[PDB]
Amino acid sequence: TTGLVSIWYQTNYVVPIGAPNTAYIIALAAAQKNFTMQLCKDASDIL
Amino acid sequence: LTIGNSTITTQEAANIIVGYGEWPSYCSVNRFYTLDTKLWEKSSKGWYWKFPDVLTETGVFGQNAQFHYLYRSGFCIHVQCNASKFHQGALLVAVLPEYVIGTVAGGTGTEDSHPPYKQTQPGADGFELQHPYVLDAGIPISQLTVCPHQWINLRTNNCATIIVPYINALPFDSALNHCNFGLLVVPISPLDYDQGATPVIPITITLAPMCSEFAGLRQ
Amino acid sequence: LTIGNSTITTQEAANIIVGYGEWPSYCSVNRFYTLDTKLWEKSSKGWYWKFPDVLTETGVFGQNAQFHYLYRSGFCIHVQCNASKFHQGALLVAVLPEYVIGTVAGGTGTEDSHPPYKQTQPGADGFELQHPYVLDAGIPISQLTVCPHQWINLRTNNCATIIVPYINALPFDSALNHCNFGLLVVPISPLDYDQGATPVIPITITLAPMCSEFAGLRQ
Amino acid sequence: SHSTAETTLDSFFSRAGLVGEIDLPLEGTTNPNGYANWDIDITGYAQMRRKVELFTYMRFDAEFTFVACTPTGQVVPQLLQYMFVPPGAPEPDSRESLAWQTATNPSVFVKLSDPPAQVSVPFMSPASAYQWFYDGYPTFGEHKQEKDLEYGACPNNMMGTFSVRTVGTSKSKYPLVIRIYMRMKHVRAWIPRPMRNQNYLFKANPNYAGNFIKPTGASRTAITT
Numbered sequence: 124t125t126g127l128v129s130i131w132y133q134t135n136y137v138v139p140i141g142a143p144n145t146a147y148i149i150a151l152a153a154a155q156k157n158f159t160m161q162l163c164k165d166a167s168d169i170l
Numbered sequence: 171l172t173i174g175n176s177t178i179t180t181q182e183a184a185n186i187i188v189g190y191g192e193w194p195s196y197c198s199v200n201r202f203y204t205l206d207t208k209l210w211e212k213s214s215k216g217w218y219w220k221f222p223d224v225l226t227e228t229g230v231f232g233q234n235a236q237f238h239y240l241y242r243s244g245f246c247i248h249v250q251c252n253a254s255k256f257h258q259g260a261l262l263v264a265v266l267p268e269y270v271i272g273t274v275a276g277g278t279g280t281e282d283s284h285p286p287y288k289q290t291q292p293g294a295d296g297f298e299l300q301h302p303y304v305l306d307a308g309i310p311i312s313q314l315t316v317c318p319h320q321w322i323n324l325r326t327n328n329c330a331t332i333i334v335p336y337i338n339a340l341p342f343d344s345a346l347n348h349c350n351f352g353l354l355v356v357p358i359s360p361l362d363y364d365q366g367a368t369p370v371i372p373i374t375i376t377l378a379p380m381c382s383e384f385a386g387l388r389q
Numbered sequence: 390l391t392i393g394n395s396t397i398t399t400q401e402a403a404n405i406i407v408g409y410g411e412w413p414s415y416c417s418v419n420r421f422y423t424l425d426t427k428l429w430e431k432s433s434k435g436w437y438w439k440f441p442d443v444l445t446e447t448g449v450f451g452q453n454a455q456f457h458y459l460y461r462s463g464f465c466i467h468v469q470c471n472a473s474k475f476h477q478g479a480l481l482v483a484v485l486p487e488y489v490i491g492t493v494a495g496g497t498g499t500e501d502s503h504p505p506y507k508q509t510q511p512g513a514d515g516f517e518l519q520h521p522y523v524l525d526a527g528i529p530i531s532q533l534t535v536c537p538h539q540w541i542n543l544r545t546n547n548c549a550t551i552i553v554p555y556i557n558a559l560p561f562d563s564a565l566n567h568c569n570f571g572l573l574v575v576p577i578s579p580l581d582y583d584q585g586a587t588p589v590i591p592i593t594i595t596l597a598p599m600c601s602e603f604a605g606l607r608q
Numbered sequence: 609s610h611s612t613a614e615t616t617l618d619s620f621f622s623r624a625g626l627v628g629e630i631d632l633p634l635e636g637t638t639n640p641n642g643y644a645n646w647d648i649d650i651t652g653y654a655q656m657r658r659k660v661e662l663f664t665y666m667r668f669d670a671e672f673t674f675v676a677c678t679p680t681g682q683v684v685p686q687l688l689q690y691m692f693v694p695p696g697a698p699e700p701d702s703r704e705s706l707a708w709q710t711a712t713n714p715s716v717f718v719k720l721s722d723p724p725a726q727v728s729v730p731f732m733s734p735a736s737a738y739q740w741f742y743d744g745y746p747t748f749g750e751h752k753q754e755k756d757l758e759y760g761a762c763p764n765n766m767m768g769t770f771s772v773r774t775v776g777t778s779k780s781k782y783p784l785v786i787r788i789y790m791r792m793k794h795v796r797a798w799i800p801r802p803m804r805n806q807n808y809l810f811k812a813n814p815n816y817a818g819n820f821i822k823p824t825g826a827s828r829t830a831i832t833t
Contacts, residue, residue: 127608128175134207134374139254140367174607267799268664270741275815282815301820304806308816310823313802337799339665339739349743388393 171200173230178204184248184331189318194244194335198343199380203229206295208373210259215302216356220271222345227294231379238382241345247332247353248376253324259361259371262354263330264319267337269352272307274300302356311356345382390419392449397423403467403550408537413463413554417562418599422448425514427592429478434521435575439490441564446513450598457601460564466551466572467595472543478580478590481573482549483538486556488571491526493519521575530575564601621668621795625656628788630772634780642703642780643773646788651740651812661804663797665737671728672770675787676720683721684782686774691715692729693769695761700771708773717775728793732767737798739765741814 138144205228208217226236249263273289275282299306320330339348353375361371424447427436445455468482492508494501518525539549558567572594580590613619630644638644651657660666676688691713693699700707707713718725747756748764774780809817 125608126174126606129608130175133178133204134252134372135209135370137252137254137257137368137370137372139256140364172607173605176607266802268739268741268743268801270743270814273815274818275809276818280809280817303820304816308804308806308808308814309802310805316800316802339742340735347744386392388391388395 171202181250181329184329185327187320187331187333189333189335192335194333197242198336198341199243200378201229201231202376202378203232205375208296210261210357210361210371210373211369212361214357215299216354217296217298218269218305218355219296219353220269220349221351221353223349224292224294224296225377229379231382235382237384239344239346239385240383241336241343241379241381242383243336243380245332245334246378247334248329248378249320249322249331249355250329250374250376251322251324251371252328252374253371254368257324257361257363257367257371258359259324260357260359261322261373262314262319262356262358263322263332264314264317264354265332265334265351266314266317266354267351268339269349269354270307272305272309274306299356305354314354390421400469400548403548404546406539406550406552408552408554411554413552416461417555417560418462419597420448420450421595421597422451424594427515429480429576429580429590429592430588431580433576434518435573436515436517437488437524437574438515438572439488439568440570440572442568443511443513443515444596448598450601454601456603458563458565458604459602460555460562460598460600461602462555462599464551464553465597466553467548467597468539468541468550468574469548469593469595470541470543470590471547471593472590473587476543476580476582476586476590477578478543479576479578480541480592481533481538481575481577482541482551483533483536483573484551484553484570485533485536485573486570487558488568488573489526491524491528493525518575524573533573617795617797621659621792624673624789624791626653626787627656627790630786630788632772632774632784632786634783643700643771645699645769645771647769648767649812654808658804660740661801664741664799664801665739666795666797667731667737668792668795669728669730670790670792671726673724673726673789674718675724675789677785677787678783679785685721686780686782686784687717687719687776688784688786689715689771689773689775690718690727691771693771694732695763695766695768699769700773703773708775729768733765735764738767 203225222235222241225232227233229235247265251261253259271289273282273285303311305311318332318334320332322330334351336343336350338350355373363369422444441454441460444451446452448454466484470480472478490508492501492504522530524530537551537553539551541549553570555562555569557569574592582588609615627648627650628646630646632639632642632644650660674688674690676686678684689708693713697710697713698707708715716725716727742762742765745752746762747759748762749756749758772786774784804814805823806816807821809815
């Protein structure tokens, strides 16, 4: 019912000597113009 | 043009090289084929590929190209070699039309039967040259540059492109019956690097043919 | 349009019938599909077919339609019934939109689990109606004519055609997820013939959709 | 240069040289049947062969001549026959074979006392141009597992066959020695191919041997002059 997205290694990671051997990755997300909701829901969790 | 989540990061500054100053011809498309990454090592001697028989397994339209007989397309071949700014190496890319694979006939008796199927099928990954000086065919490696080629230097560039039209043995050509061409990649100066650095150099090759033909016959 | 030597003899005098006086629509081709011949017998009660799931095995583009999700086409359905000049019989052809298959819940206890896969899959050949008066669904056979149909009489005609556009439960429609329609063929007057004559009446049905869509998604 | 006629591809291929050597002794075992045959093997001689692989696609015609002489070089009163065998036509099998009198096979009556005569054959290849390398199977048949009768002689590459015979029911009285020369008039090539330089192992198959030699080793070291 739902779609899937994944990240794969196309090639190996190469780094020059004298540089850190690993890094960290971050990502951003948003909504497009044509995105909208239809009907309200009475949802609450905390507290 | 994405298969689910296939949106790779691609270069926008390719070095445009034309072949004989001639664009391809009509009957005589946006899918970018992706191959597995190649690892370049200090003791590596270079690889080779055979088209279109091996090409019919990597591409999305290549997989369907197994069942397509004829071709009508223009080839834009992209070879990509990413590396750091302090790495050392040199690579040669060239295309050899009508590249006949040279079988090796060793042993005490210089005679062999029809070429074995093991030698004819190296797989979709590719094979390594036994003696890359003769391209495993008795053909000197010094003379490749007469054919279309491109110089790849780590200090100079990271990518290259080759464009070649269809050249066949007959005016009426068959792609699944007649082997067209192949690609040759061989190091000229062995790669060197400092101790502890990354010892693997990635190689990727990208091509984008337009379309093929089904054909078919009945009795 | 021949697969080797597939050049059949076809009729050129079809009786053109339009559906609601409306031609099909655009996005919201020459391959003629061939099915196995059907044998009509004196004790036969009529058959039924389900599309597009069963259609994805007989057609040349139908076989590829197994992997195609959406549709965009117009349906020109040709039903052909060849017979001699001294044969007797009558046949009804009609299309029932949103034709839900009626499962049979017998036994001492009137309760069954989720529909078995045996009942859901009758094969590519087709299935026979257990009680054709209710179409095996509790729906009277007297009322089929309100839906589009055609009268086939041996004394009158030998062929008929039906044209129907795409009608689905949602503005955005899925062909591999939602069952669209089906065809119903049922005899009204049992066939009669003289002793020693040919007891088998051939039935062939031909349809020619235009094209389908691949779709696809990734995570 | 201005006078570049001697430097063109025609001039680079304008030379008549040794192509065939067939002997017909009066008595022996090389030809105890009084006749012989010769297949056109340009690749047999590495001299003329090495020239052609400089290009891959090439077109060429040819002309052929015949010389009859004794081991001492005397001239004798006899006649000899020459005929071109197309791939479809069958080769002769006996001295009294029915193929000699076949009308569709062109043949000429020649007296060897007459100074040598020369004949030419035009483009016989069914394809547009010759291909010295066929990147595939030697046979053009639909079977790829058996030893077909068409193996070796494929219609797409073969360019004919010659046979020699001394016609006459009366027995020949003299020994014969025959030498064959060929030359080309029109030559045209399309795509260059890197030159084949290393040692050859087979007569018509580019397969090579494991003992590696280099074309040159004269220079000892870079510092050495």
